[model samples]
Target chain A: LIGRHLRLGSVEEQPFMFFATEGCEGNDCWSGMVNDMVVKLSEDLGFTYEYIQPDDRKFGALNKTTNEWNGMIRDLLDDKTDMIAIDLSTNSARKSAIDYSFPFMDAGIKAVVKGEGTTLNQVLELLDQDKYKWGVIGSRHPETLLKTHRDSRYSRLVDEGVELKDLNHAIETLRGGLFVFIDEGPVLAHNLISDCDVFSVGEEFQSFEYAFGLPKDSPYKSLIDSHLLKFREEGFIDILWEKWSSG
Target chain B: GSKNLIGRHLRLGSVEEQPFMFFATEGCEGNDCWSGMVNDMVVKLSEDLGFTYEYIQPDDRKFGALNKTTNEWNGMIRDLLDDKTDMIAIDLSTNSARKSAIDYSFPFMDAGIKAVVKGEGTTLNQVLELLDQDKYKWGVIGSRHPETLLKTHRDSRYSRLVDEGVELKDLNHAIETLRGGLFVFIDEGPVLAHNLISDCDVFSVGEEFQSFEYAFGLPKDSPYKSLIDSHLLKFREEGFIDILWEKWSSGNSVC
Candidate 1:
């Protein structure tokens, strides 16, 4: 019965949410993991959708002093869009402000270092604090996770000015032998573009689940959540992930 | 993972052509929305080749048609060219114009253009008498197999009535109009008019006038082309395609 045209908000992140410019017209140019989810969800739930971009496409981060959020979260808070269709990470902070469907992707913060081999010895050296400089994407979950280090030596990396930039910038920083940590999804996407192999140092530092988000108490929340459970049970999400992530 | 996409997932562009590929209206949930001959075939191929696939619907809901005026193509062809989709599986016909832009796998099914007319109430003499009329109307879906054949006929006496630039979902209107008086032409394999339109006694007017083979469309210079085509050839030799044709195109043939 969810047959209304929903305005879907998404950020242009590769393999998660983005537009395929060629062979498509108008708002029909979208394709990616979340786009595929929207398609299947529409089929399962019986609704059509139009893709809308957030004013600022970053995953929203809270401005603690002002108690206001920016980017996609702000769009949701203002009711500018019906739902967030991109890979918005499910965390305690965002969970308090918005509702999310059941998690569809299990991703984690990982460290990307230059070279072909990221052995135990190399990982230990990279984490020695004095041995290498650390970098992370600015205003992302990985940046927040990087700052939570309790050890003085590890915390000093952030206090001493971590090289905060976008995923591609951090990738370039890593290529210059400046150690960088970022989310596994964007890291993997860049891995396909890098000329040589890059290694992930250590296992996932902080794991998070990704789900579709909407303003708290929105009517579509429970309906989408229930359909997501059905989608997971029937392996539809796997079909979507495997489609976008692979070559 | 193996070198040749052993564990990699393939993107598949598909069209909602009946009996070939379509969305099931009943007994389907979630990703099981698509069900048809092509769906089953892709499943079997995945099992045999150790590769997985995801089926993506083209924006136009057509089995690839070229717009000569715009120099652009729609449906699966555009998807393949733009790298939006890896391959296509549908009842797409193999033609010289398409072969130039993309490669095709070995055909899995053979169908032919045929005419359908009311079965009862119209006597043989009455049908012959009607055939002698100076002008006649024929109903057909645009870009459908029958339309290609009709365009080639180029007869001044025969006028084809089709909804140009119409959505595929509204095709039932054309078929409904056909039942009023005119004859309709379509592929002989998945003859949907018999079931799609209730209370209509329709039968094939004659044997197939022109035959066409249905094949999977692949991207040009694709490494998977030879492998996929060879696999299809094996399926044909092993009678797998025949088994599917029998199961999907039985009395109640609604793709």
Candidate 2:
């Protein structure tokens, strides 16, 4: 075994990998399900690890103008960190540049809105409002889905020049009116847990499984993949789900 | 140290906790009697790390419990501290109290204390109010999270019921005992899993309490700590940990 110390890349995503002022030291200042998973993995693989936040400060997306990726993906491609153990979606574009371990969660894009005396049957009512608007984080898949969906409401909003905003703004907009915010399912789920007035609306659309992102042709890929399959076969993932999702 | 462990038979201690570790009464060879999530995890780790292991059972039939009179520990932690065992792989909860006695590998499972009540309850507030009275009772599996519960609710007035020990055979047994209008405290995972196969109308009341992570128990300054931690970390990140949990915890069976 090559007992080596490695740097694990991460980004600020609630319940995944985010920083807090207390509880640990520098680099180890991060906590969340993903950080927890990385700690557990280091134990299993016989290695030491330090957390690395990407310099680009993005979750990795193609900047069409520059013809390159701009976030944690760039960190991996540039070999700045050994691997990424954050809650990154395993999409084809990103997968083309890096490898992925077996998916730990089937996190998908979902919609959230204010629950305030509302029911699932009344979901369509938001659309009927005279000044209702839908909000989404800029450069996120949820925004892309809203932009491309054949549903005329999305096209109408785009045509009407609705402002694209971050997740917080989206939530504020939804809380202010009969608006909706589209975001990653886990984010919405986290919101649903801590807030009583916010609830997920409808089913998940454009789901993507989340897996650890490894460098292309990294030696650790096969090992991680085999263990991941065995973990699913053995039911350890459920234990993690019970812990992270509910904890 | 990792190389020295290769081919050496390390003594891994454990206690029976369904889906995590248990002795297979049948369909196994001599000393090959163990089966469960952590049991299978050892097998996976051994194969990957090239180590041979022997499973040892605690004489007290307990994972580890503090012995107040002796000012020492009993069961697995005792064995490890005394150098009688090299490691323990099971649903061993991690707490600061235990950490002082022995080091633990990274937690493989995360569970929290849940308040389980029979479905026939009038209201949770009524149950809370009833807890103040001496007649109502609360149960749990041994003293697992009792101390935490005792301290957390010390000023909240929920301390009275938790003082009564409700150690049972398993979560199934606890659920059976809960059928009487009494409440039981246990991990949320097993309780939720048990509700699926059984006919009991039991449900968890309130949010989960005292959430904790679980890991393999190792001796302080043990050489195998880093080795074992590495395997656990990789297993979790790679999804092998989740796979093992699904097989043992998801089905309709008690496992």
Candidate 3:
């Protein structure tokens, strides 16, 4: 074993917390890559990062951020930390609270299904022919899909002959293979794909971005922005993506 | 030949509430058959603008397009263009693709594409209102369809529901498999929802999740664009949108 560790810098860019709720796996665990990345990128960018003590708050069996997401975000805004790397979004609530970066990750919603009988192409074709059954996330998605589909003759064939349903029982049906379900794409891409009989519908059906969040234009803005840009340019982002994507 | 005012008129249009211009069938009525939310908006616009306007509805929801059904703009515009209907008032999005055909006024309605399924309740809204709690296993449209419930789950305590895209689809199919279970999706818009709501097996959902802009579509060169733009600006200043929404939804308006 090496006897010494490398000292990167003296000045830290304000301590930041990595929210870990068992979201990531192995070295890619929520804290793993985030913790390592902050350290490595901090050194590469000539900044310092004092890893805050870890917080392990599970989101119940549902596997969400729950209190953990809120607490970390609270830490960032309360000056307990400066930035947070997590799966987040921008809307009235988020916009009012923090500043988000240009998404470092281009993510989207996905439909995961058993790897056997049907594929996304087949589903689209069924929709195009209006012949097979179609399913939506909930009342809202089906309405939106139908609204978009109603305007197009491309899906007319399927519109004429198929049936539509709104099911909340996806996990059960997925195993049973009677229906195709949909959801946010990245989460599906993250878990339950490889090594299993499930995968995402397409590359990314609906798109959003994941960025470094700060407390509304913190002083560390430029540094985080440039670091993300450099990460993209150096293809480290792609590497991270591939690593996390694998089973 | 005089002032290129061939298409202008000053008719007294009466609506029960706000003035909304719609490209509905020439004679639209809240009758036994059915009229859609867009039609209601049109009726409201007629009163709001109080301009002599023609009610032109296309045979299909083509919106005065080439009838090629290829334009990627909101179908409300398709309705507007199909009948060559001017000053179309409907809940539509004015993204770049739509800018090519017509100019949009300030966003009046904020909604998105949604789906509906049958439910056992006093109203479809009541059935859909169950989302406020997190006990259900909701199906999802494969990624091709857009809805916000997926986001709610992905972002909320129910994020595990999103981990499998196909599972989401399977969830959507679960209703069909169950034969009696039902749900809905707020996807594209009412054009499709209107058609599906009557299916003996399906019904509509609440409007909160469907956020979109309701704007007026005018010809790119039509001076009316500026007029509505100014009106919308003032409306924002006066918070007329809030007034209108309160008047319309009373308190449940999602805009």
Candidate 4:
């Protein structure tokens, strides 16, 4: 047995490698839990594991295959990495590509502006009926949401050369102008603007989930499921939250 | 004989009403045709494909081919789906978001996301890296191209250090400031930005960006899928695409 109480059979305990995208703080928040989960399976249950860090941002646009695991799926299929243990969610689209363990985290896409200022939706609602404006990070969930919601009033500010502007600048473009910026909770949460007084905050826009993705038809699915069940039963996840966000 | 098959015959989206194609409404003239040819490819497509299909007399004005109205490209595709048009062909990248809604044929070409900044030594990453130390202000056409770079700069620690979103007409307005202390022009594509010719104090990178490929798009679920796929494979085998590239991009291309 390894760590605490766990045992494994020969085939199940065989060494296996896994890959992970680096630098999503919230997702990485579970680094301890993931490491623990792997150790428990490996030493005690007889499985082997490895981790891989690719690029800067964990799941940015270029990495994920268009919307597939931030394009990191290429790593797993090619055996460069066995599984990716990042804050991947079990959504319908994702279910098509890889198997997901029980959800480890749940959060929504909320608007965050420095401190508590005017909310994003308020600005959107207050926007002139004729004006079409919204700010979004490139290729993020919010960008997709806005495009999908295209009929909602503001036309996306897509022009000929706006490719170089960042989310904050896109929002700032509305300064003295009229527009609303729909953004992620973490991005909007951490955004800070000074002197521009025009920088405002908005309410939570929508909710999205985060979950880790694994190989389809992997034998380890049951093992992970059992761990999640025990995590729920033993309050391991709650303890994990306390260790990271609260502690 | 092979030379005749050089250009492409793309049947972009269909039209339900009179003037089914979005470009059908735009006016083109023989006189205007000469200049608009380089900047806009849609106009050229009309000329190249028009006679092959008995569509109409090719419009001479180049700008006429551009779809300026509300997602006119979308309308073109809608027409294609309805069988009013055979294909929707253009010199644009196959955006991923549009994938779920349509099927993009194989990438026929690759385009790079170049940085168009004022004069000497203004690559995208370099200019961006300089923002932390030097005061740099850049402007791009508002809501025009993908805002990836702009969003990146604004979100990073350098958020406080930059200025953004200039009107298309005023893109050059920041040239002096950029030269003075901090100002730059940033654009995504090389085709339009590379044409600046330094007189405007501008230049684009020769290295293509992550964004490329001007491909054909089929309906999300269409019966004609395999036929188009075979056609593309044949086009590749026959070097038809290569000939089109030579004609359109070989000689005067900014590269």
DockQ of 2: 0.05
- Give the poorly placed runs of model 1, Cα more than 4 Å off: A20-24, A117-131, A148-163, A185-196, B1-255
| Candidate 4 Cα outliers beyond 4 Å, as residue runs | A1-44, A56-70, A119-140, A144-202, B1-255
Instruction: Please give, for residues A139-172, the per-residue lDDT of candidate 3 as tens digits.
Output: 2222223323324642343244223232224455
Candidate 2: regions farther than 4 A off: A1-247, B1-4, B26-28, B67-69, B119-130, B146-158, B164-176, B179-188, B250-255
DockQ of each: 0.01, 0.05, 0.01, 0.01
* Local accuracy of candidate 4 as per-residue lDDT tens digits, B66-170: 133454333344455455545555443344333424555534444444554554453444544545444445555333223323333325532222243343322
Show model 3 residue runs off by greater than 4 Å: A1-33, A46-71, A90-92, A115-182, A199-204, B1-255
Please report the TM-score between candidate 4 and the true structure: 0.34
True contacts kept of each: 0.00, 0.00, 0.00, 0.00
lDDT ranking from best to worst? 2, 1, 3, 4
Interface RMSD of candidate 4? Answer: 20.9
Q: Which candidate is the best by DockQ?
A: 2
lDDT tens per residue, model 1, A1-247: 3668888877777777767658988567987777777888898788888877665556676766798887777788888888988877655556557766545665666666666765434333545556566656555555554454344544444445465555556656777764544555543654545546666666654445577887755777646755664564345666776677745
Model 4 accuracy (lDDT, Cα): 0.41
TM-score of each: 0.45, 0.54, 0.32, 0.34
Q: Which digits, one per residue and each the tens of the lDDT, describe model 1 over residues B25-106?
A: 6897744888888898898888887888887877766556566579787767888888888888887765544555776665
Each candidate: RMSD to true structure? 21.3, 11.8, 22.7, 24.1
Whole-model alpha-carbon lDDT for candidate 2: 0.64
Q: What is each model's TM-score for chain A? A: 0.83, 0.80, 0.52, 0.57
Note the B-chain TM-score for every model. 0.77, 0.83, 0.46, 0.52
